[PDB]
Design a protein around this ligand. Sequence first.
Ligand SMILES: *c1ncc(Cl)c(C(=O)O)n1
Ligand SMILES: [Zn+2]
Length: 195
Amino acid sequence: SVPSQKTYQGSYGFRLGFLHSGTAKSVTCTYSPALNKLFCQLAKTCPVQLWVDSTPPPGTRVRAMAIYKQSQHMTEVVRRCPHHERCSDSDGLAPPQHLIRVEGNLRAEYLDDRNTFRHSVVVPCEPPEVGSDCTTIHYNYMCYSSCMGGMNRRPILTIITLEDSSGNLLGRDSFEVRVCACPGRDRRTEEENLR
Ligand SMILES: *c1ncc(Cl)c(C(=O)O)n1
Ligand SMILES: [Zn+2]
């Protein structure tokens, strides 16, 4: 089984947004619109904006899940490598096997799917606060793209789904992720390679 990655704004006009962080050597998280790709350091804050055209119903949730991008690896569950899953970096909520965490949200729930065995993290969809036009979720990625026995240099996609209270699909967006030591440099390199 492979989760859909089809972009779907749905009834509420759901889509993601990203900050403009640049590509300086000091940057820890940066998004490339040209590549639709987030570059980030291990376990560092990744702000992801949620934008809607109209407010979805109370009980709407936002789920994140990783899959492998490449055709020949899409059926394999994305998980932390044998090193990082045994790290003592628990936050009290995320299972140690999960690549994607939500930072600083006590209502985050982590799912180990009983059928597909895939991991995901889900939070309530909060409306924007006063003085803001969007809401932001802070994600952390807990293994490097290069980790042996884990992602093993294989690119991943994060799929963000807007769901109703039963888990039915309301909206979908996605982006590639590279977890790496030098996200600014790697973004510059990959944007050059594309050009
Ligand atoms: C995971 N958790 C803790 C530590 Cl100290 C390490 C490491 O070997 O750097 N990994
Ligand atoms: Zn790892």
